[PDB]
Design a protein around this nucleic acid. Structure first.
Ligand SMILES: [Mg+2]
Ligand SMILES: [Zn+2]
Lengths: 176, 38, 66, 136, 94, 130
RNA sequence: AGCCAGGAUGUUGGCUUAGAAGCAGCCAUCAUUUAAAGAAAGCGUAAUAGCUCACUGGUCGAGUCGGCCUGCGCGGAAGAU
């Protein structure tokens, strides 16, 4: 909408504890907590919440919009969770799921193991396609970026870790 | 990235943003159009 | 329709320039009129002359002056 | 380049540039590049701007120049002392006052004229602006 | 069609005119016929918007001051030297 | 479009039905010029020399525009329902033209129904010329 | 504003051009059809092609649009105890 004008609707089963500028949400898919800015006053007096900022600020509408978007995303990820996946295009790019540690042997003389947050799960049906699930899409994106930072998709050949929806380009190197 | 004094849009697909102390021009398709106001 | 029967303008498909250039094609009063009047298959409507006049006037703008 | 064929005198005083401009109205064309600042324009800069606008718009339209340097600006060579006379004439510039109209153009689209005069301004040192034909 | 409102200049001169221009209203003079000239003042923005049309100069206009609506023309306009402003529009009677 | 044409749109919508507006729906895929000329030709040759398959989807045109017949004309307004209006008569073969066009790769939205003039259900009656 | 869909034909036209075809480069941008086609704006294709864009319609629910006058700011702004 214009400024957080469109309300969020909270489904049943998602317990929410609002205390001033600090909010906690508990659901089946984990638990989340956020303490907000000074441009907030979101209220919860019905089946859902609808946000408001605090009076006496030049800003505040944009902050209310940001808080509404973040809380909607967190509600969605606490009621159903979010999932992402990465594809390793290239021979020898082996990915292994050792529980809470990923092993990524990608043409490296030194194999690299990466840790995972406590609220993130991962699994790979093969050695190249990894799929992970989490509650917080912010943390999900952070860990996905950490995983992908080990190698970027080189335009000249097309190898390296990338997202499933990532579109790589191969224009021309030298014709040979 | 091309760092210059006066920045503009090469193609319509370029978007201009203002970050911490600078102004940047980012093109989704062509990396060459990436520019900064140094 | 408008491709294989429009390439039959003066003997060649198209070989002329607009204002005054290397033109190889000319036009008579009915040569390109028949290709749009005799055909009741490509006509969007019933007005054959509506699209006939367009071709007769664009022959000049292509190089096939009247 | 723009230079008088002959002059009554070859050396002139520095002078000043006080006052407004007389040729502030568009008369010889439909669009004009009007100088909004103050300073001096050299024949070299005028030639550069003319070439810029000539490249910008083709034989497509007529262009008039409402200014002419008429002012011989001189300089002294390197490694020479002061006094002992006045240096030889080096180039020709004019005195430009605010509101002065430099280049006029007719027979061109408005957007093309805007682009051509923007390119001419990019070459000209003095700040300029675009003025349309006056209804008056 | 063109209808403008005016006020009578209490004071006239360079200082008064420049103060009026700083106050965003410019003076004008109305003469012609067999009556003494009158020094009026107009809002600048309204006249600037109205003068855009060629009809403003090629057609009769009317000016209203102290309830009197007198029809005049526009013969001479003095534009600002380097700004999109007009100063001291000239109105001729009849 | 412009308001000057929106005026004419309503003027035509409340003048179309007076002489009989046999109406139907055309697919967005079937409205492509590569495959719309066949339907245009069929409808024009069947009815007259003029045709109107242009869609004018509106919500307020279903409360003050198209509805001028007995009771039911507001069911073709929302949810991507194209408008195809024909002037010559309220019981002509225009319904059958779209019924035939259905057999040739046309299953788009609402089974080519509109204006419910001859109490037409999903299956066409015998009133239409056979 | 997003999303969805449409966005032909002569024409891969004719000079140079193993090639020029909407894009080394261009000489030339014409016309009917429809609500929509510009010898096509882009990438790139040797070059065709391909899609989006120009343009059009539909789903979404009250502000938005690009011009002028100016005020305060932003980057241009790197030197040696
Ligand atoms: Mg004084
Ligand atoms: Zn770009």
């Amino acid at each position: 909408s214009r400024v957080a004008k469109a309300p969020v609707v909270v489904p049943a089963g998602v317990d929410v504890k609002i205390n001033g500028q600090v909010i906690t949400i508990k659901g089946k898919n984990g638990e989340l907590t956020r303490t907000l800015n000074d441009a907030v006053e979101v209220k919860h007096a019905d089946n859902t919440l609808t946000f408001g900022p605090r009076d006496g600020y030049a800003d505040g509408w944009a902050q209310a919009g940001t808080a509404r978007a973040l809380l909607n995303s967190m509600v969605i990820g606490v009621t159903e969770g979010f999932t992402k996946k990465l594809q390793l295009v290239g021979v020898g790019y082996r990915a292994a799921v050792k529980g809470n540690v990923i092993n990524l042997s990608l043409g490296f003389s030194h194999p690299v193991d990466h840790q995972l947050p406590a609220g993130i799960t991962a699994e790979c049906p093969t050695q190249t396609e990894i799929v992970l699930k989490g509650a917080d899409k912010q943390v999900i994106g952070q860990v996905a970026a950490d995983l992908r930072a080990y190698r970027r998709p080189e335009p000249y050949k097309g190898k390296g870790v990338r997202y499933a929806d990532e579109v790589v380009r191969t224009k021309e190197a030298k014709k040979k | 990235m091309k760092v210059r004094a006066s920045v503009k849009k090469l193609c319509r697909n370029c978007k201009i943003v203002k970050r911490d102390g600078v102004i940047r021009v980012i093109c989704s398709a062509e990396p060459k159009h990436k520019q900064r106001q140094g | 329709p408008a491709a294989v029967l429009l390439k039959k303008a003066a003997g060649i498909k198209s070989g002329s320039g607009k204002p005054n250039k290397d033109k190889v094609g000319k036009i008579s009063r009915a040569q390109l009129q028949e290709i749009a009047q005799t055909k009741a298959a490509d006509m969007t409507g019933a007005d054959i002359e509506a699209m006939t006049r367009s071709i007769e006037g664009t022959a000049r703008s292509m190089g096939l002056v009247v | 380049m723009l230079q008088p064929k002959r002059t009554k005198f070859r050396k002139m005083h520095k002078g000043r540039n006080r006052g407004l401009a007389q040729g502030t109205d568009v008369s010889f064309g439909s669009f004009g590049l009007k100088a909004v600042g103050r300073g001096r324009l050299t024949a070299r800069q005028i030639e550069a701007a003319r070439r810029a606008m000539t490249r910008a718009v083709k034989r497509q339209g007529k262009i008039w120049i409402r200014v002419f340097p008429d002012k011989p600006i001189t300089e002294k060579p390197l490694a020479v002392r002061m006094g002992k006379g006045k240096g030889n004439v080096e180039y020709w510039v004019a005195l430009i006052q605010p509101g002065k109209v430099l280049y006029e153009m007719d027979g061109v689209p408005e957007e093309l004229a805007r682009e051509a005069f923007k390119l001419a301004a990019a070459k000209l040192p003095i700040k300029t602006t675009f003025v349309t034909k006056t209804v008056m | 069609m063109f209808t403008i409102n005016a006020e009578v200049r209490k004071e006239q001169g360079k200082g008064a005119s420049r103060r009026l221009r700083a106050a965003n209203k410019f003076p004008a003079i109305i003469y012609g016929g067999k009556e003494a000239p009158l020094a009026i003042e107009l809002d600048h923005d309204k006249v600037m918007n109205m003068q855009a049309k060629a009809e403003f100069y090629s057609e009769v206009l009317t000016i209203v001051v102290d309830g009197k609506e007198i029809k005049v023309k526009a013969q001479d306009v003095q534009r600002h030297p380097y700004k999109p402003k007009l100063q001291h529009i000239d109105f001729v009677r009849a | 479009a412009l308001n000057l044409q929106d005026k004419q749109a309503i003027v035509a919508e409340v003048s179309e039905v007076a002489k009989g507006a046999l109406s139907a729906v055309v697919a967005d895929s079937r409205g492509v010029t590569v495959d719309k000329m066949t339907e245009l030709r069929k409808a024009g040759r069947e009815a007259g020399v003029y045709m109107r398959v242009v869609r004018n989807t509106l919500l307020r045109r279903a409360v003050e525009g198209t509805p001028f017949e007995c009771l039911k004309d507001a069911f073709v307004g929302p949810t991507l329902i194209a408008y195809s209006m024909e002037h010559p008569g309220a019981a002509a073969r225009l319904f059958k033209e779209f019924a035939k066009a259905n057999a040739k790769f046309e299953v788009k939205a609402a089974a080519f129904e509109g204006e419910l003039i001859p109490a037409s259900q999903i299956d066409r009656l015998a009133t239409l010329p056979t």
